[model samples]
Target: HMGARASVLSGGELDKWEKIRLRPGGKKQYKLKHIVWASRELERFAVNPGLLETSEGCRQILGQLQPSLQTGSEELRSLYNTIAVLYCVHQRIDVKDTKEALDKIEEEQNKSKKKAQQAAADTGNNSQVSQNY
Candidate 1:
């Protein structure tokens, strides 16, 4: 599933969402709470949600939160779900299932690397390898 982009929230917007949008009484409320908590946590920590270094750490931090915040589960699955969403917002890793597509991607990567090396040789600039990725 394609994830929506993360939005920078103002205090008033966060309050409105937390109080009005997410303060309903049901399963929907529980789900919406995760969104607020994750966003607030990101803002508070001044963290890059997309950065891999912070992803797992943020997930663990969320997991350490109170159990009632998530649904009535034995473990912190909702927090984990929040982490998944956060990671999606942070970066999308597209996976190709077909062998042809996979091979094509690999081939393209190989070609790009060769091109990078050739350019480096031509310019005598080994220190500045192209960061195509």
Candidate 2:
């Protein structure tokens, strides 16, 4: 099953990456391990969207992968770009530029939050009006 394969790949890579962090050295190797682990996670999501409960899971991984930009590796950045594309597609979001997709997702989140707050405020007003009657 895709689920089982995805889980195993992500779990194995994550464990390997974490284990390397215990020692103080191997700075270059540490970053490489992180890239591998992150790429594995990205591949899982790309291959099996059902493995994640929601698009939010993709966003969470994207957040983690963003730091890789600082490492200045084009390959890592390419992986990040692919994940960003997947995230936007899963969320049914439209974007003109793949590089700016994360910012677009954040905007969508804020819009939803504002809409929820407005709905809550409307309900509260209704209760207050009923109390007055």
Candidate 3:
């Protein structure tokens, strides 16, 4: 089973993940250890994310692991979700670009607001003109 294939996080295994996931002086070092377990599963299959996607055999191996991932300690189950999001970010998304996207949206909204205001002013002016006539 690919799921059981990965070992749970332990000693030096936990340390290595911390280096990648934690900052120096970080208060919560334990959070990153869950990946160690996920890493082991990847190692067992000798499959990286690319291999998981590209090889049918690798996918089957991962399918075997899914059950283990789906059922675990609450925190362990959460780690599976975390990695899935990270994988999405590694491929489909970019957090760094999110702010820029938001800024552009704000600008478009501002433009729409200004256009509405201008239309309102024009309508008010037309009403005044009709009264004078």
Candidate 4:
């Protein structure tokens, strides 16, 4: 089942989900893997199920995944929340501009930081040792 498949492939806390995904509502366990298993059910949610509108179904998935925010991986947390915000905002406004602004901000920030970053490069024969050539 979808829920079974979505179960977190890590940690010993989720060993019981194997039996939960089968049978008539076979069994249930409250864990990250549950969402993965539940996702199996959503695989058939009409053509192109909108994540924003299908809140009842999709939001629960988000709910399950939210606790991962406290994980050791900052990049993972940032990307996950980024998608959450992107999905939430893109549903209301044109996020393409958001991307542009983020890109511009990142570019400007990089340039501002480059003074220090490229200082080492400036002191060497390789002027543009690595400026994203």
- Per-model TM-score, in order, reads 0.25, 0.39, 0.27, 0.25
Stretches of model 1 off by over 4 angstroms after superposition: 1-33, 38-53, 59-75, 93-133
**Between prediction 2 and prediction 3, which has the larger TM-score?**
2
- Looking at model 2, the pairs that clash are none
Model 3: CA > 4 A from native: 1-37, 45-66, 70-79, 94-133
lDDT of 3 at 120: 38
Q: CA shift at 58, candidate 3, in angstroms?
A: 9.4
Which residue runs does candidate 2 get wrong by more than 4 Å?
Answer: 4-41, 44-53, 100-103, 106-133
Q: Write the per-residue lDDT of candidate 2 for residues 1-133, one digit (tens) a residue.
A: 4443343224433343333221235332233244345446555534334333246666665676567556635655655654554455456653434444545655542345343433433433334345463
Over 25-86, each residue of candidate 1 has an lDDT whose tens digit, in order, gives: 33233233555555545434434433322435444444443343464343334433443433
Q: Which of 3 and 4 is ahead in lDDT? A: 3
2 versus 4: better TM-score goes to = 2
Q: Which candidate comes out best when scored by TM-score?
A: 2
lDDT of 3 at 60: 41
Candidate 2 has a TM-score of 0.39
lDDT of 3 by residue, 9-32 (tens): 334433433433222344343234
Local lDDT at 32 for model 4: 31
Per-residue lDDT of model 4, residues 1-133, tens digit only: 1222223232332342222221224343233333342333333322122342243433443454445446424543333333233333323321223233233333431235443443343453554556584
Candidate 4: list runs displaced more than 4 Å. Answer: 1-58, 93-133
Clashing pairs in 4: 2-37, 2-40, 3-37, 3-38, 4-37, 6-36, 7-33, 8-33
